[PDB]
């Protein structure tokens, strides 16, 4: 009788949907309108042929095409890979008819931002190992009953967790963060005490038991760029927080501005397809110009300061944030802050 | 209410003591022992600075929490018979956190300009450090209180809009106008806190 | 002692190689655009992150702060 | 776009359109929409079959409730069947009513159960 | 049977993690000879003569890592044995 339950629900649905047909039966005008895609018309007319085969009336049971001006529904044709990421975006809002699909870009820029937020080596390795376990054992777990609903929604995001762990491993490598300690792989370039003795640096370490004895930049051979990531010495420096804060704040702001310009440039595609000259002409253009003029300048200024000022100019090194406050308030004091570059006015 | 009575008793005792002490001292020709200069010159500028720094984030966080709860309770409760309102009405929470974001940025900005000195007497410290400490305290206080009241108003109107949206879909998109107009006062508070400390050169 | 032109050349050439060559030689199937977007945006984000991390160190302003024990130890380890 | 056209009409009434729409539902690649007038649910051409279906669901719900109170697990791993549109289905539901009727009499025998307790309580006045 | 598989799987992965991490940390101590960046902890309040005492003590410290690895490996073997009790 459980089979009968399945059958009963089926026929109930059939009759309920057949109720929707037209409100007349003269000349056999019992007709119902249907949303159906284009790639599956052959199966639909094959179904109609099957229905007439089950019927003894031998009638074509077909009708000609027509078009109206209603709003069609949207369906994201997913496969084993894109589904986990399309479901994540559809959870907040359903795209219009022909909206720029955001899954193809999201599928990657999501774990990247996560890895920026979660940039550690060992934890990333653990996540990718869990991903490998869950991916390889998919067939048995799928054909298995589990009481843990948390595990079901975890299992939904398979390739999510996989790519997330991969980029987490990468960003653990790039910060030279590995369980909170750097990995000195191919050399340090900062502390050379035998060279430091040239610059009046000897016998201080007797008082070293109670002082800190700052290291300067460029007594002649210091500085130099580590080819890959953060120099390991910073990991043991007591003032690491200052440089780490500066570098991380700047990276975060730069990442955020390019994300937004990406957004608006992508929007320009959305409007040009829909044949809306007004929106492109008096929409996209002022907003992109505003975004650029207001913050691409900040990005370029940050990069200029990075590639411009050496160690010997540590006195009166210009500060960008105060210059931005003066950008907003239009205030130019005669002194107190030197111009970062000539002709800034 | 016992707590209100306790607060009233403490407040009334405090002000009665102040009034009586003031009157007897003024009648007693002892105005030379009321030298407010010593009171506002013994205090270090760094105390004023650091109190301002603490408040400039503390009060903003308090306002953010107030608005968060006041809108979230109604958002969660009213969606039982309409799950559609979970994602439509997330703007209020976003603004309730943007308040704290502004507070943190202001804390970072004012946190600068903290170079110590060596003077230990009023004649040696000078006017500049006193101005710095007072200005930083004032900026912290104003930004904190502005963002507090801002967050409270934002949360209240967010609750109202979220609760009203469950009746008819075409309501919220126009009721959010008051929601957006809420944040302007916090923006003004940040601007004034910026301007008050634009000429400090402590060091 | 480290070089700067050599690493920038090596990593820029590697990331250009992947990000440009990968799209050109994909099989003609149904999953073409997905893989193209994945690889291209990967190379972009990856290389940009490395470039920012490396330029943040070029031309430092102040050296590290090292305890005295580390100052003693670095004598006879890095040398 | 996702689709080029989505409002083609290829459906016409027949004497066995039930089988046509059943097979179309089996396909699982269409959605239905009509009845702009929004008539009341009890002015319908097919109201009687919906009422019959509701009666079958009510009877079925009662029997499955009784089964679940028996703590007897149900197994559902067989094939998906095809609905028997001709009048044979009628005979089937007749049998189902008999099943429900048996359950009714079983509850009548639960009257006996009450009598049992009218004596078990009696045992507790042994003193 | 004893120490059912439900927790024994977690125990086995934990033991594998312990063996691997302890072995690698010990090897990092020994091969790099306990560079202060990767090896702060130690026990000596007097080293002003020379580095040889420091190196000897750091070798002594790094020695315990392999004992920890052996204990973790024995734990993993015990858990694997309990898994076979079916």
Swiss-Prot record, chain B:
Ubiquitous. The keyword Transmembrane helix applies. One of its GO terms (cellular component) is vacuolar proton-transporting V-type ATPase, V0 domain. Residues 1-2, 72-89, 158-174 are lumenal. The record marks 97 as: Essential for proton translocation. InterPro entries: ATPase_proteolipid_c-like_dom (IPR002379), ATPase_proteolipid_csu (IPR000245), F/V-ATP_Csub_sf (IPR035921). Residues 24-50, 111-136, 196-203 are cytoplasmic. The chain crosses the membrane at residues 3-23, 51-71, 90-110, 137-157, 175-195. CDD domains: ATP-synt_Vo_c_ATP6F_rpt1, ATP-synt_Vo_c_ATP6F_rpt2. Pfam families: ATP-synt_C. GO terms for biological process: proton transmembrane transport. Signal peptide: none annotated. GO terms for molecular function: P-type proton-exporting transporter activity; proton-transporting ATPase activity, rotational mechanism. It is a multi-pass membrane protein. Belongs to the V-ATPase proteolipid subunit family. V-ATPase is a heteromultimeric enzyme made up of two complexes: the ATP-hydrolytic V1 complex and the proton translocation V0 complex. The V1 complex consists of three catalytic AB heterodimers that form a heterohexamer, three peripheral stalks each consisting of EG heterodimers, one central rotor including subunits D and F, and the regulatory subunits C and H. The proton translocation complex V0 consists of the proton transport subunit a, a ring of proteolipid subunits c9c'', rotary subunit d, subunits e and f, and the accessory subunits ATP6AP1/Ac45 and ATP6AP2/PRR. Interacts with IFITM3. This is V-type proton ATPase 21 kDa proteolipid subunit c''. It comes from Mus musculus (Mouse).
Swiss-Prot record, chain C:
One of its GO terms (cellular component) is clathrin-coated vesicle membrane. Residues 1-5, 55-79 are lumenal. GO terms for molecular function: proton-transporting ATPase activity, rotational mechanism. It is found in: Membrane; Cytoplasmic vesicle, Clathrin-coated vesicle membrane; Cytoplasmic vesicle, Secretory vesicle, Synaptic vesicle membrane. The chain crosses the membrane at residues 6-26, 34-54. GO terms for biological process: synaptic vesicle lumen acidification. InterPro entries: ATPase_V0-cplx_e1/e2_su, ATPase_V0-cplx_e1/e2_su_met. Residues 27-33 are cytoplasmic. The keyword Transport applies. Keywords: Cytoplasmic vesicle, Glycoprotein, Hydrogen ion transport, Ion transport, Membrane, Synapse, Transmembrane, Transmembrane helix, Transport. It comes from the Eukaryota. It is a multi-pass membrane protein. Glycans are attached at residue 68. Belongs to the V-ATPase e1/e2 subunit family. Subunit of the V0 complex of vacuolar(H+)-ATPase (V-ATPase), a multisubunit enzyme composed of a peripheral complex (V1) that hydrolyzes ATP and a membrane integral complex (V0) that translocates protons. V-ATPase is responsible for acidifying and maintaining the pH of intracellular compartments and in some cell types, is targeted to the plasma membrane, where it is responsible for acidifying the extracellular environment. This is V-type proton ATPase subunit e 2. The gene is Atp6v0e2.
From Swiss-Prot, chain D:
It is found in: Cytoplasmic vesicle, Clathrin-coated vesicle membrane; Cytoplasmic vesicle, Secretory vesicle, Synaptic vesicle membrane; Melanosome. Disruption phenotype: Embryonic lethal. Knockout embryos die at 5 to 6 dpc, before gastrulation. Predominantly expressed in neurons in the cortex and in the dentate gyrus, CA1 and CA3 regions of the hippocampus (at protein level). Expressed at lower levels in astrocytes, oligodendrocytes and microglia (at protein level). In the cerebellum, present in Purkinje and granule cells (at protein level). Belongs to the V-ATPase 116 kDa subunit family. V-ATPase is a heteromultimeric enzyme made up of two complexes: the ATP-hydrolytic V1 complex and the proton translocation V0 complex. The V1 complex consists of three catalytic AB heterodimers that form a heterohexamer, three peripheral stalks each consisting of EG heterodimers, one central rotor including subunits D and F, and the regulatory subunits C and H. The proton translocation complex V0 consists of the proton transport subunit a, a ring of proteolipid subunits c9c'', rotary subunit d, subunits e and f, and the accessory subunits ATP6AP1/Ac45 and ATP6AP2/PRR. Interacts with SPAAR. This is V-type proton ATPase 116 kDa subunit a 1. It comes from Mus musculus (Mouse). The gene is Atp6v0a1. The chain holds residues 6 to 132 of 839 of the full protein.
Curated annotation (Swiss-Prot), chain E:
Keywords: Cytoplasmic vesicle, Endocytosis, Endonuclease, Hydrogen ion transport, Hydrolase, Ion transport, Membrane, Nuclease, Transmembrane, Transmembrane helix, Transport. Its EC number is 3.1.-.-. It is found in: Endomembrane system; Cytoplasmic vesicle, Clathrin-coated vesicle membrane. GO terms for molecular function: RNA endonuclease activity. GO terms for biological process: endosomal lumen acidification; proton transmembrane transport; receptor-mediated endocytosis; receptor-mediated endocytosis of virus by host cell. The keyword Acyltransferase does not apply. Endoribonuclease which preferentially cleaves ApU and ApG phosphodiester bonds. Hydrolyzes UpU bonds at a lower rate. Regulates the activity of vacuolar (H+)-ATPase (V-ATPase) which is responsible for acidifying and maintaining the pH of intracellular compartments. Required at an early stage of receptor-mediated endocytosis. Belongs to the RNase K family. This is Ribonuclease kappa. It comes from Mus musculus. The lineage of its organism: Eukaryota, Metazoa, Chordata, Craniata, Vertebrata.
